[PDB]
Amino acid sequence: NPIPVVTVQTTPFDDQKPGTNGLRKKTTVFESKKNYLQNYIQSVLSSIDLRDRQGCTMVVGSDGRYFSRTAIEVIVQMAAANGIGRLVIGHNGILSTPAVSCIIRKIKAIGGIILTASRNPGGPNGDFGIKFNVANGGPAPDTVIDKIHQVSRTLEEYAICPDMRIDLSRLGRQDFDLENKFKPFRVEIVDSVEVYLNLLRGIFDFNAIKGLLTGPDQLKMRVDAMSGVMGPYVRRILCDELGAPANSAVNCVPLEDFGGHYPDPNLTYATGLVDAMKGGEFGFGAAFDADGDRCMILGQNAFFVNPSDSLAVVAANLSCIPYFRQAGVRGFARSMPTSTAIDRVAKAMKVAVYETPAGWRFFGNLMDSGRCSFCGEESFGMGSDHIREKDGLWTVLVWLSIMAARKQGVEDIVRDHWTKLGRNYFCRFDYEAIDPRAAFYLMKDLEAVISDKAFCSQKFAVGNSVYSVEKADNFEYIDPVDGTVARNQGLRIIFSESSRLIFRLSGGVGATIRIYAESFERDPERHNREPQVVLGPLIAIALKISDIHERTGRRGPTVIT
Ligand SMILES: [Ca+2]
Ligand code: NA
């Protein structure tokens, strides 16, 4: 009754370079470009050491987008033919990125494959992605990234078990006897929320949260899963377990196309939530991305909690959470483009702060060496060492726990925080799908100016606002664990007037330039100012000095947050 192992001849693709958040292509590429999915999967598998690959376990999940159930079928076939012993898969293929990280860590899997494009639309016309996480549970480190690219560039063949078929609909085991293999290749379809839920039980006070979402004084919340993966997570956790009304759950039926909407939590694409939070009926609002790792939070009347502020506010109030009461707090970390608001909190409560490059994987070594307990990014990301990924619902539960302890509302906390520590006005401009070449020459020409020998003695004037350059360079990071240096991680112009400008280049299939602007103000009276007025100038400096409009032929940013 054996299942044969078939080796297929193939020719390599040149574009299979995995980005900071996996390999993202239009669904057509994976679905029609022959041997494209197989080539990449085999590459991911070959990056695993040959010795360690035998009999090991991997976790597989998706956000439910179109082509996921087909990608998983190929994943189990190629996994079996490559010696993997067991695959843990989510019911119906549904497993959020935080849950995948939690499973990898619990059962001590060698890694996990996540089918998702995070903030990108899904469906036959939409996009598709493949993320690969390693043993510690976080995203693949740079070493693995290069290894995958190297293999993908030289792949001549791949192994697969085409005669293998799997049913995700019913939970349990599905043993397969492979040829020339004693132990049966196992496949475990597990509950999508159970293991992840039990992790949260040990972190938070579910009684405290349950009481806030219950009673005459109950909090009225609207949680928008955007028809992604987090639908069943909020329904089973927030509603069923924590007692929130059913109407609190919105767009919680995972759809292949996300109902035809973008799952990008922010003031631009989560308009469905902002409209309701503008009505004024709800005291708390939250939206998740497709895979459930990013999260936007809104107060009453659509009070926008800036993710950099969200990270600092939470840091300042971690005592409300049992997890950090017991284990304490060993350090904070933030990506470099994230505002220095957390730095304020840390210098106050005497805790270390690490300024890492953009990308959650750079948080792995800090947590694995006990140097960091809590971290986040301006990119709507936050998390702790309960796993090694950013966790959306963890952020909501964190905020609900701080609200039940403070006995206040969202805006009350944030403004109180501003009074005690000052406000870090912050915003980000995104220029998506711009010509990759122009984006490149824009960034090195700009670096050439930033790097000039006399640039630090330059002053920029917008009306009566003057910004004097203090230090500017191309960001560089030295890993404190292995001592490896990460370069070209974002240009920086630090002015000696409590302000920063950051320029970051990341990956039609074109480039994306993001411009971050930060300005700090001490006086609480000037904390009511409009961010557009505080940050308006800084951007004007950034636009003239970068000349991004003329260089890219764009008239405005694709997105503002
Ligand atoms: Ca994501
Ligand atoms: Na992502």
XYZ file of C-alpha atoms and ligand atoms in Angstrom:
563
model
C 0.000 0.000 0.000
C 2.983 2.376 -0.102
C 3.064 5.980 -1.282
C 5.899 6.502 -3.799
C 8.468 9.287 -3.610
C 8.744 10.968 -7.020
C 11.622 13.244 -8.037
C 10.636 15.886 -10.607
C 13.130 17.646 -12.847
C 12.731 21.413 -12.677
C 14.475 24.624 -13.668
C 15.172 27.401 -11.147
C 13.425 30.749 -10.905
C 15.478 33.896 -10.358
C 12.970 35.988 -8.365
C 12.372 33.603 -5.427
C 14.064 35.901 -2.922
C 12.091 35.803 0.361
C 11.345 39.221 1.814
C 11.201 40.338 5.420
C 7.648 38.953 5.523
C 7.909 35.942 3.229
C 7.635 35.478 -0.516
C 4.665 37.422 -1.915
C 3.431 37.103 -5.498
C 0.148 37.376 -7.344
C -1.885 34.193 -6.945
C -1.363 33.499 -10.656
C 2.384 33.004 -10.174
C 1.919 30.235 -7.606
C -1.120 28.743 -9.353
C -0.100 28.737 -13.039
C 3.678 29.264 -13.313
C 4.517 25.565 -13.374
C 6.746 24.204 -10.594
C 6.770 27.633 -8.930
C 5.140 26.491 -5.687
C 7.087 23.223 -5.745
C 10.438 24.904 -6.382
C 10.014 27.315 -3.472
C 8.639 24.716 -1.048
C 11.527 22.364 -1.823
C 13.858 25.311 -1.237
C 12.310 26.016 2.173
C 12.674 22.323 3.015
C 16.233 22.029 1.690
C 17.306 24.992 3.833
C 16.588 22.687 6.777
C 19.635 20.604 7.660
C 19.507 17.133 6.129
C 20.233 15.410 9.448
C 17.697 17.462 11.413
C 15.020 17.089 8.713
C 14.447 13.358 9.279
C 11.409 12.571 11.414
C 11.080 16.200 12.520
C 7.766 18.039 12.890
C 6.507 21.133 11.072
C 3.425 23.301 11.602
C 1.346 24.444 8.627
C -1.342 27.120 8.598
C -2.979 29.775 6.461
C -5.232 32.826 6.606
C -7.888 31.166 4.433
C -7.141 33.163 1.284
C -7.732 31.586 -2.114
C -5.284 28.792 -3.080
C -4.368 28.016 0.556
C -5.975 24.563 0.621
C -4.120 23.746 -2.602
C -0.807 25.050 -1.257
C -1.210 22.862 1.834
C -1.872 19.746 -0.258
C 1.445 20.261 -2.040
C 3.126 21.067 1.283
C 2.251 17.734 2.895
C 3.227 15.817 -0.249
C 6.647 17.459 -0.514
C 7.122 17.386 3.267
C 6.610 13.613 3.323
C 8.918 13.001 0.358
C 11.612 15.076 2.111
C 11.679 12.942 5.269
C 9.563 15.102 7.583
C 7.983 12.894 10.222
C 4.890 14.866 11.206
C 2.864 17.869 10.065
C 0.610 19.711 12.515
C -2.066 21.539 10.517
C -4.953 23.753 11.539
C -8.570 22.736 11.099
C -9.582 23.623 7.532
C -6.025 24.912 7.137
C -6.797 27.843 9.447
C -3.997 28.839 11.833
C -3.047 32.426 12.627
C 0.610 33.422 12.578
C 0.662 33.897 16.389
C -0.950 30.480 16.862
C 1.614 28.907 14.526
C 4.398 30.448 16.616
C 2.733 29.150 19.785
C 2.443 25.616 18.388
C 6.019 25.459 17.074
C 7.272 26.435 20.530
C 4.965 24.095 22.455
C 5.592 20.843 20.554
C 9.154 21.944 19.691
C 8.702 21.730 15.935
C 11.603 22.531 13.628
C 9.579 25.327 12.047
C 6.357 26.193 10.302
C 4.986 27.261 6.934
C 2.298 29.964 6.927
C 0.243 30.653 3.792
C -0.577 34.356 3.999
C 0.214 37.759 2.507
C -0.596 39.660 5.729
C -2.017 42.981 4.519
C -2.558 42.025 0.867
C -5.877 41.118 -0.771
C -6.665 37.501 -1.551
C -8.573 35.648 -4.225
C -7.883 34.418 -7.760
C -7.049 38.020 -8.716
C -5.454 38.802 -5.339
C -2.042 38.002 -3.906
C -0.533 34.979 -2.166
C 2.404 34.440 0.164
C 4.538 31.854 1.939
C 6.175 32.652 5.284
C 8.589 30.223 6.949
C 9.285 30.259 10.690
C 12.075 28.333 12.412
C 12.504 26.345 15.634
C 12.344 29.262 18.080
C 8.988 30.224 16.522
C 9.933 33.557 14.973
C 10.404 34.424 11.307
C 13.319 32.927 9.431
C 16.608 34.743 10.184
C 18.734 36.322 7.483
C 20.866 33.170 7.278
C 17.824 31.060 6.395
C 16.606 33.733 3.964
C 19.859 33.595 1.994
C 19.900 29.789 2.149
C 16.404 29.622 0.648
C 17.353 32.094 -2.082
C 20.576 30.209 -2.843
C 18.734 26.896 -3.226
C 15.927 28.470 -5.256
C 18.549 29.894 -7.630
C 20.181 26.476 -8.176
C 17.273 24.035 -7.857
C 17.357 21.287 -10.494
C 14.782 18.868 -9.041
C 12.394 18.361 -6.142
C 10.826 15.433 -4.297
C 7.080 14.972 -3.830
C 4.470 12.287 -3.075
C 1.773 13.105 -5.658
C -0.402 10.149 -4.587
C -0.996 11.734 -1.154
C -4.291 13.375 -0.200
C -5.411 15.034 3.033
C -8.778 16.051 4.511
C -8.625 19.184 6.669
C -12.341 19.194 7.505
C -12.319 16.582 10.297
C -9.898 16.749 13.216
C -7.660 13.830 14.141
C -4.766 11.880 12.670
C -4.092 10.769 9.095
C -1.229 8.270 8.968
C 0.516 7.530 5.669
C 2.895 4.618 5.075
C 5.597 5.932 2.739
C 7.878 3.677 0.721
C 11.172 2.814 2.437
C 9.995 4.414 5.700
C 9.230 2.497 8.891
C 7.402 5.102 10.957
C 4.135 6.396 9.440
C 4.211 9.946 8.112
C 1.758 11.606 10.501
C -0.631 14.486 9.830
C -2.411 16.105 12.793
C -5.374 18.387 12.090
C -5.727 20.268 15.376
C -8.158 22.850 16.715
C -7.251 26.304 15.456
C -7.703 28.166 18.750
C -7.392 25.683 21.619
C -3.611 25.620 22.085
C -3.389 29.355 21.383
C -6.203 30.047 23.854
C -4.517 28.137 26.679
C -1.372 30.207 26.139
C -3.428 33.362 26.726
C -5.050 31.961 29.886
C -1.666 31.889 31.615
C -0.841 35.415 30.434
C -3.934 37.461 31.321
C -6.560 37.637 34.063
C -9.584 36.347 32.165
C -11.836 37.149 35.126
C -10.762 40.796 34.990
C -11.350 41.028 31.232
C -14.618 39.094 31.474
C -15.906 41.559 34.064
C -15.089 44.571 31.899
C -16.936 43.147 28.881
C -19.871 42.190 31.137
C -22.351 43.893 33.432
C -24.250 47.186 33.351
C -20.941 49.051 32.956
C -19.842 46.693 30.171
C -17.528 48.043 27.487
C -19.051 48.330 24.015
C -16.410 47.105 21.568
C -16.294 46.454 17.828
C -13.606 44.027 16.631
C -13.114 43.802 12.860
C -11.379 40.595 11.792
C -11.702 41.794 8.167
C -12.929 38.321 7.165
C -9.414 36.933 7.641
C -8.047 34.289 9.975
C -8.945 35.940 13.305
C -12.692 35.400 12.875
C -12.953 32.209 14.930
C -10.309 33.488 17.362
C -12.330 36.476 18.580
C -15.596 34.516 18.520
C -14.238 31.706 20.697
C -12.027 33.902 22.902
C -13.540 37.380 23.219
C -17.202 36.383 22.906
C -17.551 32.766 24.044
C -14.829 32.756 26.704
C -14.597 36.410 27.776
C -18.331 37.070 27.450
C -18.374 39.868 24.879
C -21.641 40.213 22.920
C -21.865 38.574 19.515
C -22.259 41.958 17.795
C -18.728 42.776 18.989
C -17.393 40.336 16.371
C -17.350 41.817 12.854
C -16.189 40.205 9.602
C -15.338 37.053 11.559
C -16.195 34.546 8.812
C -12.896 33.800 7.010
C -13.340 34.331 3.271
C -10.987 33.451 0.428
C -11.101 37.056 -0.833
C -11.673 38.677 2.590
C -15.018 39.824 1.223
C -13.092 41.679 -1.469
C -11.379 44.062 0.964
C -7.804 44.872 1.957
C -6.798 43.374 5.359
C -4.431 46.256 6.216
C -5.192 47.579 9.733
C -4.930 51.365 9.569
C -6.907 54.573 9.035
C -6.877 53.938 5.257
C -8.193 50.412 4.615
C -10.145 49.682 7.828
C -12.718 52.346 6.945
C -15.536 49.981 7.900
C -14.402 50.081 11.527
C -13.527 53.786 11.640
C -17.019 54.671 10.403
C -18.583 52.877 13.378
C -16.063 54.278 15.860
C -16.922 57.734 14.505
C -20.574 57.185 15.413
C -19.519 57.408 19.057
C -21.410 54.358 20.331
C -18.342 52.167 20.937
C -15.641 52.727 23.539
C -13.116 50.356 21.956
C -12.361 49.395 18.368
C -9.801 47.021 16.872
C -8.958 45.578 13.455
C -6.661 42.682 12.540
C -4.806 41.826 9.349
C -5.271 38.625 7.362
C -2.894 36.481 9.449
C -3.711 38.062 12.820
C -0.311 39.489 13.797
C -0.894 43.219 13.181
C -3.565 45.231 14.962
C -4.974 48.762 14.934
C -6.684 50.090 18.064
C -9.255 52.888 18.236
C -10.857 54.694 21.154
C -14.242 56.354 21.332
C -15.116 58.650 18.421
C -12.372 56.975 16.368
C -9.575 58.119 18.662
C -6.543 56.764 16.803
C -3.975 55.078 19.044
C -0.711 55.513 17.166
C 1.068 52.116 17.201
C 4.226 53.744 18.577
C 2.110 55.262 21.353
C 0.338 51.926 21.832
C 3.719 50.268 22.379
C 4.833 52.914 24.879
C 1.520 53.095 26.750
C 1.449 49.312 27.175
C 5.076 49.302 28.320
C 4.232 51.884 30.992
C 1.305 49.797 32.308
C 2.613 46.221 32.109
C 1.971 45.819 35.855
C -1.727 45.291 35.052
C -0.880 41.965 33.363
C -0.202 38.888 35.561
C 2.361 37.564 33.068
C 4.691 40.498 33.731
C 3.821 40.728 37.432
C 5.293 37.257 37.951
C 8.142 37.072 35.430
C 8.927 40.800 35.504
C 10.316 42.913 32.674
C 13.840 42.420 31.329
C 13.957 44.885 28.431
C 12.146 46.754 25.664
C 12.774 46.701 21.922
C 11.464 48.709 18.979
C 12.260 48.888 15.294
C 14.284 51.974 14.429
C 11.515 53.773 12.446
C 9.222 53.410 15.472
C 8.892 56.575 17.533
C 11.096 57.068 20.589
C 8.006 57.176 22.844
C 8.848 53.821 24.449
C 12.378 55.062 25.135
C 10.716 57.633 27.395
C 8.854 54.945 29.352
C 11.994 52.831 29.638
C 14.304 55.603 30.844
C 11.656 56.312 33.486
C 11.081 52.790 34.837
C 14.798 51.937 34.408
C 14.653 49.311 31.660
C 16.884 48.731 28.658
C 15.723 49.625 25.147
C 16.985 48.077 21.912
C 16.705 49.898 18.579
C 16.558 47.135 15.967
C 16.049 47.221 12.201
C 12.530 46.923 10.867
C 11.357 43.313 10.991
C 10.208 41.119 13.847
C 12.954 38.544 13.245
C 15.478 40.975 14.743
C 13.583 40.612 18.040
C 14.288 36.875 18.151
C 17.845 36.964 19.475
C 16.993 39.578 22.114
C 14.223 37.422 23.592
C 16.118 34.145 23.201
C 18.978 35.607 25.275
C 16.583 37.040 27.870
C 17.487 40.610 26.895
C 13.969 41.627 25.780
C 10.561 40.870 27.294
C 8.282 43.204 25.321
C 8.566 44.811 21.895
C 6.675 46.248 18.952
C 6.861 48.293 15.768
C 5.188 51.352 14.283
C 3.883 48.892 11.648
C 0.933 47.956 13.913
C 2.972 45.175 15.541
C 3.327 44.291 19.214
C 4.257 41.215 21.203
C 6.175 39.689 24.079
C 8.224 36.547 24.707
C 5.077 34.435 25.098
C 5.918 33.626 21.466
C 8.379 34.946 18.867
C 5.919 36.779 16.594
C 3.810 39.911 16.773
C 0.371 39.032 18.147
C -2.731 41.106 17.445
C -5.283 39.630 19.839
C -2.583 39.619 22.517
C -2.485 43.393 22.021
C -6.261 43.746 22.407
C -6.303 41.579 25.535
C -3.363 43.637 26.811
C -5.334 46.843 26.248
C -8.518 45.383 27.740
C -6.507 44.296 30.784
C -4.986 47.756 31.225
C -8.450 49.286 30.855
C -10.025 46.989 33.449
C -7.192 47.789 35.865
C -7.030 51.546 35.270
C -10.849 51.793 35.348
C -10.732 54.272 32.470
C -11.228 54.542 28.720
C -8.756 54.408 25.859
C -8.322 58.137 25.252
C -8.159 58.757 29.008
C -5.095 56.497 29.285
C -3.299 57.833 26.210
C -3.724 61.488 27.156
C -2.812 60.789 30.782
C 0.312 59.123 29.378
C 1.104 62.204 27.276
C 0.886 64.468 30.333
C 3.242 62.333 32.423
C 5.792 61.637 29.657
C 5.157 64.119 26.833
C 3.742 63.448 23.380
C 5.776 62.004 20.498
C 3.925 63.234 17.423
C 4.500 60.609 14.739
C 3.297 59.705 11.251
C 4.312 57.588 8.265
C 3.959 58.188 4.521
C 3.916 55.236 2.117
C 4.759 55.398 -1.600
C 3.750 51.966 -2.874
C 4.547 50.239 -6.166
C 6.952 52.930 -7.352
C 9.639 52.267 -9.947
C 12.276 50.101 -8.191
C 15.149 51.783 -10.043
C 14.023 55.338 -9.265
C 13.378 54.306 -5.661
C 16.944 52.977 -5.503
C 18.746 55.954 -7.044
C 16.536 58.196 -4.914
C 17.779 56.494 -1.754
C 21.501 56.493 -2.574
C 21.527 60.059 -3.898
C 19.747 61.010 -0.672
C 22.276 58.961 1.313
C 25.083 60.790 -0.496
C 23.694 64.102 0.775
C 22.976 62.741 4.260
C 26.540 61.381 4.374
C 28.217 64.617 3.256
C 31.032 65.918 5.443
C 29.203 69.218 6.088
C 25.586 68.016 6.315
C 25.543 67.947 10.130
C 25.980 71.750 10.085
C 22.898 72.295 7.898
C 19.623 73.897 8.976
C 16.251 73.487 7.258
C 13.573 76.187 7.441
C 9.842 75.806 6.811
C 8.219 79.161 7.438
C 9.391 79.980 10.958
C 10.135 76.358 11.940
C 13.875 75.612 11.807
C 15.262 72.070 12.070
C 19.018 71.847 12.676
C 20.651 68.558 11.699
C 22.280 66.827 14.677
C 23.243 63.391 13.322
C 22.404 61.638 10.064
C 23.603 58.291 8.731
C 22.504 55.003 7.175
C 21.231 52.872 10.040
C 23.456 49.977 11.104
C 22.721 47.269 13.674
C 25.108 44.895 15.455
C 23.399 41.775 16.761
C 24.414 41.387 20.439
C 24.129 37.573 20.309
C 26.152 36.576 17.231
C 27.750 39.958 16.511
C 26.461 40.098 12.932
C 26.091 43.543 11.356
C 22.964 44.570 9.433
C 23.507 47.534 7.103
C 21.304 49.667 4.843
C 18.461 49.542 7.368
C 17.104 53.054 6.768
C 18.370 56.592 6.393
C 18.017 58.867 9.417
C 18.081 62.636 9.887
C 18.038 63.510 13.589
C 17.492 67.212 14.212
C 18.594 68.891 17.432
C 15.006 70.134 17.896
C 13.497 66.877 19.229
C 12.567 65.599 15.770
C 13.504 62.773 13.409
C 13.033 61.840 9.765
C 13.458 58.272 8.502
C 13.519 56.992 4.917
C 13.058 53.255 4.374
C 13.100 51.275 1.123
C 11.335 47.897 1.082
C 9.737 45.612 -1.491
C 2.756 46.315 -9.669
C 5.673 44.245 -8.382
C 7.614 47.413 -7.600
C 9.328 49.165 -4.704
C 7.900 50.928 -1.656
C 9.395 53.990 0.042
C 8.162 54.862 3.533
C 8.929 58.197 5.206
C 8.591 58.477 8.989
C 8.323 61.820 10.785
C 8.594 62.264 14.554
C 8.435 65.357 16.753
C 8.374 65.453 20.557
C 6.717 68.138 22.682
C 6.958 68.509 26.457
C 4.160 70.958 27.261
C 0.775 69.243 27.825
C -1.036 72.381 26.641
C 0.494 71.967 23.167
C -0.504 68.276 23.130
C -3.900 69.135 21.612
C -2.196 70.430 18.454
C -3.089 68.807 15.155
C -0.434 66.265 14.078
C -0.602 67.702 10.550
C 0.631 71.045 11.909
C 3.374 69.585 14.107
C 4.587 67.095 11.494
C 3.550 69.035 8.384
C 6.882 70.845 8.107
C 9.100 67.800 8.727
C 7.442 66.054 5.787
C 7.959 69.177 3.673
C 11.664 68.883 4.510
C 11.543 65.190 3.602
C 9.786 65.841 0.290
C 12.144 68.576 -0.908
C 15.354 66.846 0.192
C 14.321 63.472 -1.248
C 12.561 64.935 -4.312
C 10.424 61.795 -4.239
C 7.573 63.442 -6.163
C 9.600 64.370 -9.248
C 11.798 61.273 -8.967
C 8.842 58.857 -8.846
C 6.275 60.962 -10.707
C 3.878 60.690 -7.767
C 1.682 63.536 -6.542
C 1.043 62.168 -3.050
C 1.640 59.194 -0.770
C -0.228 55.971 -1.398
C -1.091 55.771 2.317
C -0.900 57.996 5.401
C -0.923 56.764 8.997
Ca 0.696 40.170 8.916
Na 3.723 40.258 7.099
